[PDB]
Design a protein around this ligand. Structure first.
Ligand SMILES: [Ca+2]
Length: 101
C-alpha cells in the first residue's frame, strides 16, 4: 500500500517519479544521489529520505512535494513529514523495506 518516489533533477528537470509500488521495498531502491518520498499518508506516515549526495534543490523539492501530498491526497490534516538523512533511518522507516541491514 505504501509508494516510494524519487525526487531528482538528475534527468534535466526537477522530477518526482514513482519507483516502487510493491511492498516491502528494496533497501537498494534508496540511491544516495537523490531524495526519496515514502508515502504511507493514509495513516499519517510520510517520509523524506535525503541521499547523502543529493543536492539542495532536491532536498527542498522533496520536502515541498511531501507536504503538498498531504493537501492533494487528503491525508490527515495533522500529518507531519518525517525527514531522515541517509544513515539516520528510524525503525518506523526501515519497516517498509525487506530485510534492512
Ligand atoms: Ca541528484
Amino acid at each position: 500500500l505504501a509508494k516510494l518516489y524519487k525526487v531528482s533533477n538528475g534527468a534535466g528537470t526537477m522530477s518526482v517519479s514513482l519507483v516502487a509500488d510493491e511492498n516491502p521495498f528494496a533497501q537498494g531502491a534508496l540511491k544516495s544521489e537523490d531524495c526519496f518520498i515514502l508515502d504511507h499518508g493514509k495513516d499519517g506516515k510520510i517520509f523524506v529520505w535525503k541521499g547523502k549526495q543529493a543536492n539542495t534543490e532536491e532536498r527542498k523539492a522533496a520536502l515541498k512535494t511531501a507536504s503538498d501530498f498531504i493537501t492533494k491526497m487528503d491525508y490527515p490534516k495533522q500529518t507531519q513529514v518525517s525527514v531522515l538523512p541517509e544513515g539516520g533511518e528510524t525503525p518506523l522507516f526501515k519497516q517498509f523495506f525487506k530485510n534492512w541491514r
